[PDB]
Design a protein around this ligand. Structure first.
Ligand code: L95
Ligand code: GTP
Ligand code: ACP
Ligand code: GDP
Ligand code: MG
Ligand code: MG
Ligand code: MG
Lengths: 54, 313, 438, 425
């Protein structure tokens, strides 16, 4: 048992008790992913309308 | 209607238990992977305790205590006894954990027996050697060999005692009143032949009825006094030690488990714990009675529709 | 003084955010109209509470918060509730039709069209900060917005605020109170995409909150209001160190330093005690030892799991009320002997303790009784991997048949993202296994 | 607002539609003149989903009435709530469809469809945020079946990102008008497989058996069948019309109920189903019969298949804890009939407002593979006639070729096979 780093103030206090010692995607990349998904939606929609036109 | 699942087709005990559950009309066996069950008869290895107790409105019970392996693995049992203040221990043979680690602590206690009975047994393929040479060359545990076992007469033969212990969801400890002695029908040779280390009794196994009679005739004592007090003590000691680690008192799911305790008796009528089996079988004559007791004490207590001695604590 | 910006995404995040800011105002003495008689720093000042509240010349204390939801009805509660005066329209961002419990819809279809606006609103708050330290992001795993849009926002926040810490408060899905069957999908999808962008995430399993409300508060069928008042107490005790004078967890970086040695293993388990029904006139005031011991009962955890069968990497004890270090140490020494607390070998077996003397504030007319001392334990234990295993299993059951997948592909997501996300989760489960198993 | 546009087509479609609006108008406190007179504010919160608000706080159903002959719609206009509908939303012809799918879909219906779409456009372009459309019709006739599915195709073309929901009355020889009903229904089912997100399958045979066996109605009329449907329709839409969390809009409902795009055909159920009575019903009674086959309106035994998803809506003051107990109970007692590879696939909602005259009620929406029996019945009746080309001349006379029938038969049999695949999985 050992209590260390005791900080005290009028609002309370803090400390540490030790019992044992031991033994990203850029903006452009994100835009590409969003537009690729939009493109796939637009492709699926265009196929549908082509199906409905037939 | 209660529901249960079977996830170890290879179990003799719980194949009979599920048979009894179905023979009551109030239990329905589901598919292997149906999560909407009341009772799981789980697999021996890799049981997914983390998925139990999360089905809304379902009280779920499993036939295994998570963490009980520390008692039922030879290596981890040696460590549990040595590192646990509750056990520290007079009923467990001197043992050491050595990987192919207490390699050095063993040799220290060994030679001080050679210079001054110094037979040991290595197991986890077993080897009983009088010298440490072939023992160390052979995770394994090295254990002192009981060179003075109680021998049954006639036959001058060795034996061990199997005690079945059921622990329910309330962590009550029940000892099946019927045990089994598993005898070796070969005279105990004292001077590598591993056969004495149905001629007299059927199936090479002797029940308490007969063993108690022998103890009275041959030794003027009873099974209860000379042996059963020690077995009950050892069982309680072992299971109370791990209770904080495995209890499911305030857990989102509940466990019970049937244990197989293996004891040995020396010629001074002292009982030694050999090992604890986490998935034990039963004696053919005792399957019906024990399996019914499991349903009565462990299952029906949680899901309502004595052959056990209750070890108090 | 370093400011903190809170972001609330989707119904769960918004309704929990509204509950938290109500509790903050009560804790800091801020009236519904934004006025704060305690603040002699009229129109300014850099006190501890200013990390969460800016100040206008008229003396109004405005939360540093942004609310985002792709449906108007939930955010209209904010602009019409008790604390409506607290916020101005620029803080509230609403769409017209929601993500329909569809990650793909929240992330790609709708997220692409609203991300810039949300960022514009956040930038407006950031421009107001002298030293922004990061963001606190509230959201659900199961909702199409909470999962889908949040992960997109987190990606962009890493781009636009590279140096800033990001913490999450995430609602783990529970069938007891959820209506969607696809929530396991949304949970894995958003966890995979958000993993490298979050520094510390506090998961709250609705199942745990629900059961704590039934058992300890005697509410037979808890509501979102019941759940959120309790959740906001947990959040409050976690964020108190940012809002009051102190020396533990005083900025967002200290959360990762104290709780996350392995960056991917950044999901601390929260445990809170005591939770006492306000209907019970007199309840025996629990001691420091009793409430500290309660931090090791699975029944008081924000995620139901068994820490006895895992290993600890870090432990933090956060007390509010009449607590002194002497009693904490006496309690710790007691529990260490009677509990299974195995730390990993490469971490110290210790506890970081913080005490704030103000006892927990309760909402007048709530279900929670005022107690004289309470504690929240934040422990990074491998046991919380049980939550990942459960979720991943439900994923596997549906994905093996490709059930509901067409809804996601229909919004432009590739089936490959499912397996990619699932593989990332399997690796996460392997990391917990590698850390917590002998 | 999340507006829904309602369309009723053909005799069956407009008669069931007329009753549906009568029922929900009363629930929302709207009189036959469009004036609100309710006592609870819950009636107006989501009233915009089905009603436009006109001048003078008048509420006009967002409903479009369609038929190729004037008879039924004249009856509607002279019915109880006839004057509540927008006069411009009555779109009708004179020739009729002759119980002929080809007439509704290709000839007579084609003359009229553009004028219907003009009305749809007017209602849609007035929506703050349109959810989608709900169509009521039969599949056995000509207008509802042939022209109804033509409308669905046209609506999807102009609103491809909107939900398309239908209440579709399936023919049965027991309650039959013409022998060509299997032809019309087979042709319509293929259209629905492709162009609807959710279809409530209402089998007139089941409705009849309910009225006869359970309700003790000696000789049921279409009026009796239509009150069951409107009562059922009121229950299944309660989530859309009153505040709630479960299936609160068409898309979320579809995401939760449809694991595979083609398998979107639901079996509905209603409770209580009682004969003439004032006995207070309990939650176990509501739950027990709501899940009994005799209370399900698709004439399919769910014990012959498996549930993919289930939504249950309870109405009236009741204990939600007891609701969970009974709901969670019936799953465990019928574990065999729920697929295990969709976890927690049974959802339950509770609404405070009960239908008029009932203290409490329960509505059931099931996506069960047992519905394949309904399509198999239709397929067998279709093939019994098609293999002899019986009655085909009525259709070829409108320009159709035999290949379109063969193709419809193949698509139907493929749908059945797709259900069988998941009943064995
Ligand atoms: C026929 C027995 C009548 C009433 C019994 C007792 C139950 O009524 C009560 N109060 O429990 C009913 C719910 C019964 O179960 C259903 C079958 C009724 C039903 C939908 C269709 C019938 C087939 C039709 O013939 C219908 C025109 C007959 C009566 C309806 O006017 C009844 C009203 O129907 C509602 O929708 C809500 C208010 C209820 C007043
Ligand atoms: N604790 C808590 N959980 C909530 C709350 N609201 C929703 N949830 C949970 O969140 C999940 C549903 O996601 P939501 O947050 O409602 O959905 P969303 O983020 O708004 O996304 P969409 O509505 O699909 O656009 C379910 O598991 C709910 O139980 C809340 O107020 N409190
Ligand atoms: N220290 C010791 N001294 C003497 N004999 C011993 C011993 N340890 C074990 N034995 C003997 O060896 C036999 C088997 O030992 P052990 O039980 O470890 O093997 P095992 O696990 O494969 C059989 P079980 O599973 O039934 O316990 C026992 O029946 C016992 O008689
Ligand atoms: N339940 C119900 N079914 C009807 C009604 N009217 C017709 N039907 C059924 O609908 C089919 C005939 O279609 P119908 O609507 O009359 O043809 P349409 O006017 O050309 O669309 C047959 O299967 C009838 O049994 C009705 O009022 N209620
Ligand atoms: Mg063994
Ligand atoms: Mg939402
Ligand atoms: Mg007709």
């Amino acid at each position: 048992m050992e209590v260390i780093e005791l900080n005290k103030c009028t609002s309370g206090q803090s400390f540490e008790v030790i019992l044992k010692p031991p033994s990203d995607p850029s903006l452009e990349e994100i835009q590409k992913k969003l537009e690729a998904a939009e493109e796939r939606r637009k492709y699926q929609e265009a196929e549908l309308l082509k199906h409905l036109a037939e | 209607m209660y529901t249960f699942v079977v996830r170890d087709e290879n179990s003799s005990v719980y194949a009979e238990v599920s048979r009894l559950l179905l023979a009551t009309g109030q239990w329905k066996r589901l598919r292997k992977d149906n999560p909407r069950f009341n009772l799981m008869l789980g697999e021996r290895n890799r049981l997914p305790f983390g998925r139990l107790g999360h089905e809304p409105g379902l009280v779920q019970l499993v036939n295994y205590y998570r963490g009980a392996d520390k008692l039922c693995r030879k290596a981890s049992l040696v460590k549990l006894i040595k590192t646990s203040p509750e056990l520290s221990c007079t009923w467990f043979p001197e043992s050491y954990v050595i990987y192919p680690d207490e390699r050095e602590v063993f040799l220290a206690a060994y030679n001080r027996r050679r210079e001054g009975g110094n037979v040991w047994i290595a197991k986890s393929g077993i080897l009983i050697s009088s010298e440490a040479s072939e023992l160390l060359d052979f995770v394994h545990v090295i254990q002192k060999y009981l060179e003075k076992p109680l021998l049954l007469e006639p036959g001058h033969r060795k034996f061990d005692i199997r005690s079945w212990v059921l622990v329910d969801h309330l962590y009550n400890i029940y000892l099946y009143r019927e045990g089994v002695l598993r005898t070796s029908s070969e005279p105990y040779n004292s001077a590598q032949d591993k056969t004495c280390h149905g001629r007299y009794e059927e199936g090479n196994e002797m029940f308490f009825e007969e063993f108690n009679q022998y103890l009275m005739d041959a030794l003027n004592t009873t099974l209860e006094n000379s042996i059963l007090l020690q077995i009950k003590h050892i069982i309680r000691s072992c299971l109370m030690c791990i209770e904080p680690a495995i209890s499911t008192k305030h857990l989102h799911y509940q466990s019970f488990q049937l244990f197989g305790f293996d004891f040995m008796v020396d010629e001074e009528l002292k009982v030694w714990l050999i090992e604890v089996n986490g998935a034990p079988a039963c004696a053919q004559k005792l399957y019906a009675e024990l399996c019914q007791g499991i349903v009565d004490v462990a299952i029906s207590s949680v899901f309502p529709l004595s052959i056990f001695i209750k070890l108090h604590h | 003084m370093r400011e903190c910006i809170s972001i609330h995404v989707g119904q769960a995040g918004v309704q929990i955010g509204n509950a938290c800011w109500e509790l903050y105002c009560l804790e800091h003495g801020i009236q519904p109209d934004g006025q704060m008689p305690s603040d002699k720093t009229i129109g300014g000042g850099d006190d501890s509470f200013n990390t969460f509240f800016s100040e206008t010349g008229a003396g109004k204390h405005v939360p540093r918060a942004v609310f985002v939801d792709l449906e108007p009805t939930v955010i209209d509660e904010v602009r019409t509730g008790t604390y409506r005066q607290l916020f101005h329209p620029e803080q509230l961002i609403t769409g017209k039709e929601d993500a329909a419990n569809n990650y793909a819809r929240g992330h790609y279809t709708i997220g692409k069209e609203i991300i810039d606006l949300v960022l514009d609103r956040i930038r407006k708050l950031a421009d107001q900060c002298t030293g922004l330290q990061g963001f606190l992001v509230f959201h659900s795993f199961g909702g199409g917005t909470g999962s889908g849009f949040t992960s997109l926002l987190m990606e962009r926040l890493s781009v636009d605020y590279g140096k800033k810490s990001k913490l999450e408060f995430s609602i783990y899905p529970a069938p007891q109170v959820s209506t969607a069957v696809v929530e396991p999908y949304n949970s894995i999808l958003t966890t995979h995409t958000t993993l490298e962008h979050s520094d510390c995430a506090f998961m709250v399993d609705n199942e745990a909150i629900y059961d704590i409300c039934r058992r300890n508060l005697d509410i037979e069928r808890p509501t979102y209001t019941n759940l959120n008042r309790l959740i906001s107490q947990i959040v409050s005790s976690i964020t108190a160190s940012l809002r009051f004078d102190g020396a533990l967890n005083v900025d967002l970086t200290e959360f990762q330093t104290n709780l996350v040695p392995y960056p991917r293993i950044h999901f601390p388990l929260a445990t809170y005690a005591p939770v006492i029904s306000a209907e019970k006139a007199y309840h025996e005031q629990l001691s420091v030892a009793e409430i500290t011991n309660a931090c090791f009962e699975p029944a008081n955890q924000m995620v139901k799991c068994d820490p006895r069968h895992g290993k600890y990497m870090a432990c933090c004890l956060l007390y509010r009320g009449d607590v002194v270090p002497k009693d904490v140490n006496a309690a710790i020494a007691t529990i260490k002997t009677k509990r299974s607390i195995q730390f990993v070998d490469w971490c110290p077996t210790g506890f970081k303790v913080g005490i704030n003397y103000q006892p927990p504030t309760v909402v007048p007319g709530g279900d929670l009784a005022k107690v004289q001392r309470a504690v929240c334990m934040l422990s990074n234990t491998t046991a919380i991997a049980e939550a990942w295993a459960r979720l991943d299993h439900k994923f596997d059951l549906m994905y093996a048949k490709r059930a509901f997948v067409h809804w996601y592909v229909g919004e432009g997501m590739e089936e490959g993202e499912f397996s990619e996300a699932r593989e990332d989760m399997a690796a996460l489960e392997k990391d917990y296994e590698e850390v917590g198993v002998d | 607002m999340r507006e829904i546009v309602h369309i009723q087509a053909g005799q069956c479609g407009n008669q069931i539609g007329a009753k549906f609006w009568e029922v929900i108008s009363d629930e929302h406190g709207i009189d036959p003149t469009g004036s609100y007179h309710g006592d609870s504010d819950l009636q107006l919160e989501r009233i915009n989903v089905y009603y436009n608000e006109a001048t003078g706080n008048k509420y006009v159903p967002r409903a479009i009435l369609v038929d190729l002959e004037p008879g039924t719609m004249d009856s509607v206009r002279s019915g109880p709530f006839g004057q509540i509908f927008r006069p411009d939303n009555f779109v009708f012809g004179q020739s009729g469809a002759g119980n002929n799918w080809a007439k509704g879909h290709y000839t007579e219906g084609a003359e009229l469809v553009d004028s219907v779409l003009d009305v749809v456009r007017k209602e849609s372009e007035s929506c703050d945020c349109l959810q989608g459309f709900q169509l009521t019709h039969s599949l056995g006739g000509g207008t509802g079946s042939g022209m109804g599915t033509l409308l669905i195709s046209k609506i999807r073309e102009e609103y491809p990102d909107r939900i398309m929901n239908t209440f579709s009355v399936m023919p049965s020889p027991k309650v039959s008008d013409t022998v060509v009903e299997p032809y019309n229904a087979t042709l319509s089912v293929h259209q629905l497989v492709e162009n609807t997100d959710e279809t409530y399958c209402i089998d007139n045979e089941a409705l009849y058996d309910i009225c006869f066996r359970t309700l003790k109605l000696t000789t049921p009329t279409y009026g009796d069948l239509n009150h069951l449907v409107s009562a059922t329709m009121s229950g299944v839409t309660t989530c859309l019309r009153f505040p709630g969390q479960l299936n609160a809009d068409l898309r979320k409902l579809a995401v939760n109920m449809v694991p595979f795009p083609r398998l979107h055909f639901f079996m509905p159920g209603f409770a209580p189903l009682t004969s003439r009575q004032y006995r207070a019903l309990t939650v176990p009674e509501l739950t027990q019969q709501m899940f009994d086959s005799k209370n399900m309106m698709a004439a399919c035994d769910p014990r012959h298949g498996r549930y993919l998803t289930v939504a249950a809506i309870f109405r009236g003051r009741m204990s939600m804890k007891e609701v969970d107990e009974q709901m969670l109970n019936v799953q465990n007692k019928n574990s065999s009939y729920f697929v295990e590879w969709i976890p927690n696939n049974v959802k339950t909602a509770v609404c405070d407002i009960p239908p008029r005259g009932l203290k409490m009620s329960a509505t059931f929406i099931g996506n069960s593979t047992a519905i394949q029996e309904l399509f198999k019945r239709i397929s067998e009746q279709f093939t019994a006639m098609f293999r002899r080309k019986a009655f085909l001349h009525w259709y070829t006379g409108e320009g159709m070729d035999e290949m379109e029938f063969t193709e419809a038969e193949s698509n139907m049999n493929d749908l059945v096979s797709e259900y069988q695949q998941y009943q064995d999985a």
